[PDB]
Amino acid sequence: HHHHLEAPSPYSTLVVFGDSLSDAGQFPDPAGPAGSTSRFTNRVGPTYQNGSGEIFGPTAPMLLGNQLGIAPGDLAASTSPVNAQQGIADGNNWAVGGYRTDQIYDSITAANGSLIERDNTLLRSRDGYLVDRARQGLGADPNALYYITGGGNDFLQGRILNDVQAQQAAGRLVDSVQALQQAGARYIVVWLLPDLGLTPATFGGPLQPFASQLSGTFNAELTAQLSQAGANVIPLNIPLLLKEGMANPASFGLAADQNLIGTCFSGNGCTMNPTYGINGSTPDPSKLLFNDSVHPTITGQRLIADYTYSLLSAPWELTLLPEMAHGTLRAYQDELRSQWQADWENWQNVGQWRGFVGGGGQRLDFDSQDSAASGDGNGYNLTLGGSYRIDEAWRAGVAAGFYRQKLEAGAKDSDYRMNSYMASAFVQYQENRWWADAALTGGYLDYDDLKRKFALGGGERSEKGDTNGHLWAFSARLGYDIAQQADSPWHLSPFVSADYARVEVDGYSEKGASATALDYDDQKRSSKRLGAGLQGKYAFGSDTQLFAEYAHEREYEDDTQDLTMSLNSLPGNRFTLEGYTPQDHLNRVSLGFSQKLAPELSLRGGYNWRKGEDDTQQSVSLALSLDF
C-alpha cells in the first residue's frame, strides 16, 4: 500500500531505549526557550550558546526515524514533564540521559521503570514499555523497529573496573534485547559500545588504554551473547566506523586538519576546538565529532543515522536481484510467444525445421514498496531458436537467449548488472481450433557487477560484489479459435495460462570488511501464475500479418520476501530483513508483425508491455524466421 514518491518504510514505528546517546528530550532544557527539551548534542545555531533561545539539535534515532518515514510524534521522548505540561503527546523514545544498563532494562520491563529524575528529585515517572503495553494486552510491536544504546554510564559511574564487570554490563544490555524478543520484537538495532578510550573524556590520558580494552571486552561479550540469544539484531559496529572516520575524516564531513578525538565543540568537560569550537574563530559543530566529552555533534548523529540506514536499506535493493531475472525470463518468453503467434495457424511443412534469430531491448521499472527500493534500467538480448514440425498437429523445438540487464536502484542509484543465459525445450499442439503450448526453461545467472551505494558523511559510500544464480520455469497455455476456419485470414482465441518459475541467486560477501560491508545469504523467489487472455491476428495476404494479445495473470506467490545477512565485520550476528513483495496481479499487451522478405524468410517484430501494481516492464524484438 506504498506511495511511489516515497522511500521505503518497513516499520510501523521506531521504539528506542538507552541513554544520552539516544535521548530525544526527556529532561527540560533549563537554558533553552520555553517548552524546550534536552538532548545531548550541540544546539541548532546560529550562536550555539546556552540561553541563546536556540534548541538542542536532533539525536541519531530522530534522524533515522525521519528517514524511515516514522510519524514525527513517535520520535519524541516517552516521559518528558515538558511534553505533559505543554499537552504534547508522549513519543516512543524511552532513552534517558544518565541511564546505566540496569536502568535501561527497568525502563522496558519494570513497574514505574521510566523515571525522569534530576538531583534526587523525581520529575516524572511511568511504567516500563512492556508493562504499559501489557496493560492493553500487548507485547512488543512485531512491525516496529527497536533501537538500543547503553553501557557508557556503567563506565562513567565506576561500575566497570575489570573484564568481569564489563562482561556483566554487556549481559545487562543483552537482557534488554531478550526482554523485547521474548515480548515479540522482530527487529532490534543494537550499538556495540564505542571505544571509550577514544573520547575526549579519556583520550591521551592515562585511562585511555584501560578504557579501550574494557570496551573491547564489553563488545566481545555483547556480540557473543547476542550470537546465542537468537534475537533478530542489527548490530552497529560503531568502533569500526569511528576508526574509518579517523583515517578519512573529510569522507564523513569532519575537518581533516583537526584533533577530533581530543577536542570538542562546547568545551564542557573537554578542550574546546580553537577553530570550530563554540567560541573558536569559526564555530561550526558540523566540522567536529564530539560536542562535549562523550556526546557526538550533529555530524556524528547523522553518521550514526546514515550508518544504520545503509544497513537497513540494503535488503530493499538486494531483493530486487531475483526480480531482474524474472524480468529477463519473461521478456525471453515474450519473444518466443511472438514467434508462436506469427506461426499460429501457419506452421512449416511436416518434417521441416523453422529457425529464427533476433534480439531486442528491454526496460525494467520498479516503484518503491514498504520494503523495496524504486529502480529502473535498460537491457538488450540475443535470442535464437528452432521448431520441428513432427506431425500435422504437433511441433517441438528449442530456444536460447542471452540477456544483459542493468538496474539503478535506491537513493544513490546503486548499480546492478546481470547476464542471463536461458534455454528451453517446448512442445505445441494445434488441431481443429484447439491449441496448446508447453515449455520447460532453464537458465544460468551471472551477476557480474553489484555496486551498492548509500548516503554517508554528507556524500556516499559504495560496497561491491558479484554473484551467481540459476532459474528454471515451466509455462503452458491453452485456447480455442473463434474462427471456424483454419484458412481464415484472422484468428481469435481466448486462452488460459499457467506458469511456474523459480529464480535463485547465490549469497555473496561484499568485498573487504568495512563497517558497512554486508554478507548475504542465498536468495530464492518463486512465481506461481494462472492467467486468462485473448490473442488474435490478421493476415494481409501471405506476405504480411499483424497479431496481438492481452492477458491478465494472478500471482499466488505474493508473500513479502526476506533476506538474511550479517556485517562482514561481525560474522556471528546474522539478522533477517524484509524485501520485495510480489504483487498479485499483472496485465500485458503484446503487439507483433510478420513480413515475408522472401518465400521461406520472414521478418518479425514484437512489442510487450507488462504492468503490475508496483512495476512496468517493456521489451521490443526483431527477428528473422527462415525455413529449413
Swiss-Prot record:
InterPro entries: Autotransporte_beta, Autotransporte_beta_dom_sf, Esterase_EstP/EstA, GDSL, GDSL_lipolytic_enzyme, Lipase_autotranspt_EstA, Lipase_GDSL_AS, SGNH_hydro_sf. Disruption phenotype: Strains lacking this gene produce only marginal amounts of extracellular rhamnolipids. They also show no swarming motility, and both other forms of surface motility, swimming and twitching, are completely absent in these mutant cells. Biofilm formation is also affected. The active site is at S20, D292, H295. GO terms for cellular component: cell outer membrane. It catalyses: a carboxylic ester + H2O = an alcohol + a carboxylate + H(+). Residues 348-628 form the Autotransporter domain. The chain crosses the membrane at residues 380-390, 393-403, 420-429, 434-443, 471-482, 490-500, 530-540, 544-553, 588-597, 601-610, 619-628. Residues 7-379, 404-419, 444-470, 501-529, 554-587, 611-618 are extracellular. SMART domains: Autotransporter. It is a multi-pass membrane protein. Changing S20A: Loss of catalytic activity. Fails to complement the estA mutant phenotypes. Contains a C-terminal autotransporter domain that integrates into the outer membrane and enables the translocation of the catalytic N-terminal domain to the bacterial cell surface. This is Esterase EstA. It comes from Pseudomonas aeruginosa (strain ATCC 15692 / DSM 22644 / CIP 104116 / JCM 14847 / LMG 12228 / 1C / PRS 101 / PAO1). The lineage of its organism: Bacteria, Pseudomonadati, Pseudomonadota, Gammaproteobacteria, Pseudomonadales.
